[PDB]
Design an enzyme around this catalytic site. Structure first.
Site, PDB file in Angstrom:
ATOM      1  CE1 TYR A  51      -0.620   2.612  12.955  1.00 19.53           C
ATOM      2  CE2 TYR A  51      -2.672   4.127  12.608  1.00 19.53           C
ATOM      3  CZ  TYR A  51      -1.343   3.659  12.328  1.00 19.53           C
ATOM      4  OH  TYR A  51      -0.947   3.388  10.800  1.00 19.53           O
ATOM      5  CG  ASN A 108      -5.272   3.601   7.653  1.00 20.04           C
ATOM      6  OD1 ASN A 108      -5.610   2.521   7.584  1.00 20.04           O
ATOM      7  ND2 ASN A 108      -4.967   4.526   7.755  1.00 20.04           N
ATOM      8  NE  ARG A 124      -3.514   2.138   2.231  1.00 22.13           N
ATOM      9  CZ  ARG A 124      -3.801   3.324   3.125  1.00 22.13           C
ATOM     10  NH1 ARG A 124      -2.584   3.035   4.267  1.00 22.13           N
ATOM     11  NH2 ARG A 124      -4.055   4.629   2.969  1.00 22.13           N
ATOM     12  CD  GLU A 146      -5.650   8.088   9.007  1.00 25.31           C
ATOM     13  OE1 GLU A 146      -4.983   8.632   9.045  1.00 25.31           O
ATOM     14  OE2 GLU A 146      -4.828   7.050   9.057  1.00 25.31           O
ATOM     15  CG  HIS A 154      -1.886   9.076   2.990  1.00 26.33           C
ATOM     16  ND1 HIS A 154      -1.877   7.811   3.050  1.00 26.33           N
ATOM     17  CD2 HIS A 154      -1.105   9.504   4.122  1.00 26.33           C
ATOM     18  CE1 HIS A 154      -1.204   7.236   4.296  1.00 26.33           C
ATOM     19  NE2 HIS A 154      -1.293   8.496   5.106  1.00 26.33           N
ATOM     20  CD  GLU A 172      -2.000   4.283   7.528  1.00 26.97           C
ATOM     21  OE1 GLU A 172      -2.353   4.909   8.727  1.00 26.97           O
ATOM     22  OE2 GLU A 172      -1.665   4.812   6.943  1.00 26.97           O
TER      23      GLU A 172
HETATM   24  O1  GLC Z   1      -1.103  10.859  13.808  1.00 31.86           O
HETATM   25  C1  GLC Z   1      -2.363  11.134  13.245  1.00 31.86           C
HETATM   26  C2  GLC Z   1      -3.056  10.500  13.731  1.00 31.86           C
HETATM   27  O2  GLC Z   1      -3.985   9.446  12.674  1.00 31.86           O
HETATM   28  C3  GLC Z   1      -3.949   8.247  13.165  1.00 31.86           C
HETATM   29  O3  GLC Z   1      -4.376   7.578  12.454  1.00 31.86           O
HETATM   30  C4  GLC Z   1      -4.579   7.930  14.732  1.00 31.86           C
HETATM   31  O4  GLC Z   1      -6.115   7.968  14.310  1.00 31.86           O
HETATM   32  C5  GLC Z   1      -4.986   8.936  15.339  1.00 31.86           C
HETATM   33  O5  GLC Z   1      -4.946   9.411  16.774  1.00 31.86           O
HETATM   34  C6  GLC Z   1      -3.772  10.242  14.699  1.00 31.86           C
HETATM   35  O6  GLC Z   1      -4.219  11.641  15.543  1.00 31.86           O
HETATM   36  O1  GLC Z   2       0.160   8.185  12.319  1.00 30.30           O
HETATM   37  C1  GLC Z   2       0.578   7.107  12.099  1.00 30.30           C
HETATM   38  C2  GLC Z   2      -0.059   7.176  11.089  1.00 30.30           C
HETATM   39  O2  GLC Z   2      -1.465   7.639  10.843  1.00 30.30           O
HETATM   40  C3  GLC Z   2      -2.225   7.585  10.209  1.00 30.30           C
HETATM   41  O3  GLC Z   2      -2.768   6.133   9.692  1.00 30.30           O
HETATM   42  C4  GLC Z   2      -1.557   8.458   9.080  1.00 30.30           C
HETATM   43  O4  GLC Z   2      -2.004   7.923   6.812  1.00 30.30           O
HETATM   44  C5  GLC Z   2       0.124   8.006   8.444  1.00 30.30           C
HETATM   45  O5  GLC Z   2       0.320   8.412   7.804  1.00 30.30           O
HETATM   46  C6  GLC Z   2       0.614   7.843   9.329  1.00 30.30           C
HETATM   47  O6  GLC Z   2       1.954   7.863  10.148  1.00 30.30           O
END
Ligand code: GLC
Ligand code: GLC
Ligand code: GLC
Ligand code: GLC
Length: 444
Positions: free
Chosen positions: A294, A292, A76, A165, A120, A351
């Site tokens: 985290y 995506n 990707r 996003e 992006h 992601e």
């Molecule tokens: O890191 C930049 C942003 O992108 C990510 O996608 C996370 O969902 C968000 O929590 C974060 O603040």
């Molecule tokens: O912030 C961690 C990640 O957040 C978001 O998911 C973005 O797509 C990526 O570009 C970034 O590095």
């Protein structure tokens, strides 16, 4: 307990153009809104820019060979609008197209399936000056770009993602002032959020028309698992608003043709510039939903964010160098919510990954056991999701290599491959060598 993923499962790694490519003036590229934002004092924690980054523009062949070492069957990446249409619209920059043609040919020649993100976050500055996201004119500009590049690459790229996003593009770019173009205004964020959804919907039929029967497209949403700090009515309400803000604001329009009513009310419904037919455009059928994921985010009533009347709470647990809570159950929970509530025909994790402090040992190795454990936990969650009947078709680790981490600059390393910025040497990390075993075993 676990083992093997479905036989056709797509194991990938993910990048974005501005974060890795560098060569920001090369071959007709014009400045993006990020090239301009990096000049702002305080915008990037370490004072860096994406001017050089990983120099992937020049080193892509080497990076593909690293992908081959990792055993990925999918990759990707994003396409830089400023390389394709440097004046924003009009004249195609053939040399910019040539780069993505060489990239896609080298991937397919090595057996790696390309998953292309159209947007992006790197709008050409000259186009932003004409149509910021809060300006409805942005929709036709984006569709024109989509049209140009899909015409050139659709013979070889089957998997297209429209915008990465919407929440980040609109809220961090226009609402919180943390991302390009660096504005902070509730109305601008809400206009930008609506026009991102419309741009998604108008782009979908262009992708399909420029493609063939194999072509699959969708949007990419950031979604995190949200939790109330307590059972207090005020904290349940704070969690509900934050969930609506972060998780439902785009999903509800995409699948149900409405914004979340409680938050829309709270904001001022008239601030969203909905026109007749807009929800019909936004709900245009997609082949998949890309996620995506985290972290878990825990919310209480407070006035930290004055727009939502929330503060964030950090439960006792494990945190990355981003101060993001490690909560792999959250990935199962998100995927299960999407499955039961919206029934997308296919889900992808486009992601997931972690930033921890990395050091190159005397022996030239990068020993990252926290990142390995983060990945192991989240892969196990994804496996549980598949066992529960959720149609998860692939998983892309963020990221192939250390890169420009937006407002954090180069100080936060998400790669399963280390980059020594002094030399551009790539070292595969311990987590990367482990990933190499997961891809080839198609499981844990
Ligand atoms: O890191 C930049 C942003 O992108 C990510 O996608 C996370 O969902 C968000 O929590 C974060 O603040
Ligand atoms: O912030 C961690 C990640 O957040 C978001 O998911 C973005 O797509 C990526 O570009 C970034 O590095
Ligand atoms: O693309 C315009 C660019 O010109 C220069 O090379 C700068 O170092 C870079 O950060 C800037 O944005
Ligand atoms: O009461 C609802 C309103 O008040 C809140 O304090 C928020 O600042 C505002 O964004 C919201 O529209």
């Amino acid at each position: 307990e676990p083992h093997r993923f479905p036989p056709d499962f797509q194991w990938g790694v993910a990048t974005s153009s501005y974060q890795i490519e560098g060569a920001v003036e090369a071959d007709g590229r014009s400045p993006s809104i990020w090239d301009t934002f990096c000049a702002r004092p305080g915008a990037i924690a370490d004072g860096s820019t994406g001017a050089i980054a990983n120099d992937h523009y020049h080193r892509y062949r080497e990076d593909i060979a690293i992908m081959k070492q990792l055993g990925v069957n999918a990759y990707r990446f994003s396409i830089a609008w400023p390389r394709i249409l440097p004046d924003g619209r009009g004249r195609v920059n053939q040399a910019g197209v040539d780069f993505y043609e060489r990239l896609v040919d080298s991937l397919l020649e090595q057996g790696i399936e390309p998953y292309a993100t159209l947007y992006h976050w790197d709008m050409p500055q000259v186009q932003h000056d004409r149509t910021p996201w809060y300006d409805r004119g942005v929709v036709d500009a984006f569709v024109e770009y989509t049209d140009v590049i899909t015409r050139r690459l659709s013979d070889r790229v089957k998997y297209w993602m429209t915008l990465n996003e919407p929440w980040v593009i609109s809220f961090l770019g226009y609402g919180a002032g943390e991302h390009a173009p660096g504005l902070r205004d509730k109305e601008l964020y809400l206009r930008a959020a609506h026009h991102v959804l419309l741009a998604h919907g108008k782009a979908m039929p262009v992708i399909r028309a420029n493609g063939n029967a194999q072509t699959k497209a969708g949007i990419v949403l950031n979604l995190n698992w949200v939790n109330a700090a307590s059972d207090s009515p005020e904290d349940q309400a704070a969690a509900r608003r934050y969930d609506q803000f972060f998780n439902r604001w785009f999903a509800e329009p995409l699948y149900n043709g409405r914004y979340p009513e409680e938050l829309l009310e709270w904001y001022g419904r008239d601030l969203v510039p909905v026109q007749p037919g807009d929800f019909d455009i936004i709900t245009t059928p997609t082949d998949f939903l890309a996620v995506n994921y985290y972290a878990r985010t825990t919310v209480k009533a407070g006035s930290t964010d004055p727009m939502l009347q929330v503060d964030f709470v950090r439960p006792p647990g494990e945190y990355t160098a981003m101060d993001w809570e490690v909560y792999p159950q959250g990935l199962y929970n998100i995927l299960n919510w999407l499955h039961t509530d919206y029934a997308p025909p296919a889900l992808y994790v486009t992601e997931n990954g972690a930033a921890y402090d990395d050091q190159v040992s005397a022996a030239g190795e990068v020993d990252d056991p926290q990142r390995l454990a983060y990945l192991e936990g989240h892969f196990e969650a994804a496996y549980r999701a598949i066992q529960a009947g959720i149609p998860l078709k692939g998983y892309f680790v963020w990221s192939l290599m250390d890169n420009f981490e937006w407002g954090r600059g180069f100080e936060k390393r998400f790669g399963i491959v280390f980059v020594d910025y002094a030399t551009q040497q790539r070292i595969i990390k311990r987590s990367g060598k482990w990933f190499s075993q997961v891809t080839r075993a198609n499981g844990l």
